[PDB]
DNA sequence: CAGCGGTTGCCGTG
DNA sequence: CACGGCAACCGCTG
Ligand SMILES: Cc1cc2nc3c(=O)[nH]c(=O)nc-3n(C[C@H](O)[C@H](O)[C@H](O)COP(=O)(O)OP(=O)(O)OC[C@H]3O[C@@H](n4cnc5c(N)ncnc54)[C@H](O)[C@@H]3O)c2cc1C
Ligand SMILES: [Cl-]
């Protein structure tokens with residue numbers, strides 16, 4: 470007899486789920502599992518937004534629905550995997566455990582443990598690749614032992630390898646339920662809790678909802694206009710667009726695996742086949758899926774990837790320890806509306822357009838504050854609903870000119886940048902209510918408004934909104950000089 | 966045995 | 980529409 474568990478971590482979907490399909494073959498009972506640490510939020514050292522947490526829960530609710538509609542259901546087991554699995558293996562009489570492979574530093578530790586624990590209860594463990602497009606261990610082997618370090622050579626490499634695998638077949642229409650009278654599988658014990666029930670006091674303000682169904686819905690919303698998909702160029706999108714965001718906002722879905730990377734890709738190749746004049750990497754929409762892939766690939770094969778020290782791809786830079794600047798940046802009180810609006814959108818939505826991420830990330834690091842990119846990653850990690858270990862680390866290294874990118878004099882202006890997309894300040898007005906009546910002339914630089922305009926608007930600097938914490942021209946030049954010196958030093962160490 | 970090309974800056978100038 | 984400045988970048992290509 471075959472009794473299996475299909476363990477969800479990422480890959481919160483039924484489509485393109487090889488791990489699910491293998492867990493269903495010749496099976497008497499399948500137990501769909503999500504393991505939930507109930508004492509997660511009480512581990513003081515790191516914080517998590519109710520926005521990210523609830524997005525997960527909404528996705529788990531979407532899975533529960535998908536399984537009820539096929540006879541089975543989702544089991545939200547409470548505890549730590551290394552505790553929970555040993556019991557339910559023995560209890561449920563488990564022969565097989567299937568999950569989607571996960572290349573993150575922590576997931577490898579966790580999965581090494583669960584594999585050992587499976588062996589000690591006679592449990593077979595099958596873990597297909599399906600979160601990334603390719604098997605990244607393969608991509609590295611094919612390149613000769615090391616992950617590419619430029620996108621140009623990465624694009625060649627995947628062209629050589631060929632198209633990523635197709636999305637897997639849709640799963641069974643009806644599924645074997647779990648065996649009845651198993652106390653760990655009791656519906657009173659295994660329900661999907663609400664944000665209230667896990668101990669959050671403030672409600673989630675985000676406009677994007679979790680779940681496979683939303684994910685596929687938003688996928689169809691994107692392919693509504695195949696002209697747009699074919700002609701997509703990432704640098705030409707608008708970071709001020711909030712009502713109709715100027716990119717797909719598939720990132721939260723791809724992060725949790727509500728959407729299948731391979732499906733999205735497969736759908737792009739269909740469109741590109743019918744529109745031969747389509748955009749190419751690195752700017753194309755496929756290019757964006759390959760950016761994700763490129764950073765998973767390098768990130769997963771690089772020691773200490775999410776830190777500066779001991780990271781072989783990362784420039785060693787003299788970043789200042791500066792809590793007042795960091796705290797101001799974090800708390801959306803830098804006194805530059807463009808920045809503060811973005812960092813407020815971060816907190817209230819958990820998503821901003823990439824160029825808005827560029828604005829605030831540059832400003833923290835080499836642009837203005839000279840604070841370590843690690844501190845910025847930590848803030849994003851707390852708030853982003855699409856927060857992804859490797860992509861966040863990689864992009865923070867990119868924007869601080871620490872890896873992948875080294876033209877550090879290309880500093881974004883916190884005044885001018887968004888001004889050219891949104892000169893009325895509709896984004897600033899949306900996310901900084903306090904400036905809602907400040908005339909457009911001064912909305913990006915309210916310290917330049919004369920005191921009468923401030924009082925009329927209902928927004929006096931130093932009272933209703935903070936004064937800018939630095940002079941951009943002085944500070945950005947100060948930082949450039951520091952980066953130049955830091956590059957000279959690591960040029961001198963290199964000859965050794 | 967040294968170039969080619971790079972997802973997303975900006976200002977002052979002519 | 981395009982340069983020089985910032986200050987001298989760098990991995991990949993046989
Ligand atoms: C400092 C910083 C931190 C970031 N942190 C994250 C993060 O934690 N998680 C995250 O998913 N993205 C991150 N990004 C990348 C990018 O900002 C988002 O992936 C993108 O804005 C999401 O919108 P979208 O899905 O509409 O992208 P689209 O332009 O529609 O692209 C489609 C998909 O391609 C992938 N993609 C797009 N841009 C990038 C990129 N620069 N790097 C890697 N993959 C990409 C995403 O999975 C995305 O859903 C970060 C960028 C910066 C500068
Ligand atoms: Cl130039």
Ligand SMILES: [Mg+2]
Pocket residue numbers: 969970
């Ligand atoms: Mg060239």
Ligand SMILES: [Mg+2]
Pocket residue numbers: 976977
């Ligand atoms: Mg000028």
